[PDB]
Every structure is written in C-alpha cells, then in structure tokens.
C-alpha cells in the first residue's frame, strides 16, 4: 500500500537445469509475482498457503522459467504497492563449460589489476562473468586486488547460459 517489496532467490537467482528454487518477497499478505514481457503460469499453481508468505517455489527448475521477474502486494481496488527491482532467473546447463584463465596468471600484485579470459570452443554473442555478474566470437575479455566463474550464451535466450567454467580463484 506504499512501501516497494524485496524480491530475490533462494539459495541464487542462478540456478542448474533441474534444481530447486524459490523466489521470495518480502514487504504483509497480498502478494502478486509475475514476470515481464511473457506471462509464467508455473506461478498461478502456487499454493495459496505459500503466496500469503511471500513464497513461489519451484521444485525443478526448467528452461521455460527462465525470465525477469517483479514483485509487488495489494491490489488496484484496495491499493497495491510499486513492483520490486527486476529479478533475473537465469538456467543454466544448456551448452558448454567456458575456459576461465587470468591474463597473464591467477597470480597478480596487490591494489593492481588483472584481466580474466572466457574463452569458448564454439560462437556465442554473449559472455557472462560471476564473481563468486557483469555482461561482456568465442571469446570475451573482462577486468577485475575473487573466486569467478564464467558463461556462454546466444542473445535469442539471455537467460539460458551453459555450463559454468571450472571455479577461477585469484590468489
């Protein structure tokens, strides 16, 4: 009825093909989830019991839940609240673990910088770094002094990344 409500992931907003999820909201009992551009029906099968407290679980996660999603409570007629900062569940397992190597080595100075290589066998317009994530043929360049992780993706599906890379740990 004023106050925007907190929207995030449990345990990550990243989640394995496969893998369980909820997304949560916190604000007192009118709850609405829902996600942009293209409406999600595995939300209208939550439990009512569930969307009083905020909670949307999805017990195995498919490529089809991928999406930004917003949250907000209330309705129009009693009044409702603005919708939460963009949540954006990303899936990931659809193509082919990275390569993540620091250039020139894991090892770097400190208070200097470093750059951090995702490199790919096969093309993807996309490269994604997490920092155990920010956007960028085969590969892609970013700069961090750290553990991070990588990942590929088509921009026809920017949530759907692939594999992660081996965990990279600067030391």
Same mark, same amino acid.
């Given at each position: &009825? ?11 907003? *990243? ?10 909201? %916190?604000?007192? %009992? ?9 409406? =999600? ?23 089809? &839940? ?11 007629? =009693? ?11 990303? *899936? ?10 620091? %250039? ?12 951090? %290589?995702?490199?790919?066998?096969? =093309? ?15 590969? =892609?360049?970013?700069? *961090? ?27």
């Amino acid at each position: &009825h004023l106050p925007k409500p907190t929207l995030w992931a449990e345990p990550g907003s *990243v989640i394995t093909q496969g893998s369980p999820v909820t997304l949560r909201c %916190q604000g007192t %009992q009118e709850y609405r989830l829902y996600r942009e551009k293209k409406t =999600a029906p595995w939300i209208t099968r939550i439990p009512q019991e569930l969307v009083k407290k905020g909670q949307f679980p999805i017990p195995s996660i498919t490529w089809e &839940h991928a999406g930004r999603y917003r949250c907000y409570y209330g309705s129009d007629t =009693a009044g409702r609240s603005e919708s939460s900062d963009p949540l954006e569940l990303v *899936v990931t397992g659809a193509y082919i673990k990275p390569t993540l190597s620091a %250039q020139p080595s894991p090892v770097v100075n400190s208070g200097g910088n470093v750059t951090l %290589q995702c490199d790919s066998q096969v =093309a993807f317009d996309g490269f994604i770094l997490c920092k155990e994530c920010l956007n960028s043929s085969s590969r =892609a360049i970013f700069s *961090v002094v750290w553990w991070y992780r990588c990942y590929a993706y088509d921009s026809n599906s920017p949530y759907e990344w692939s594999l992660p890379s081996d965990l990279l740990e600067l030391l």
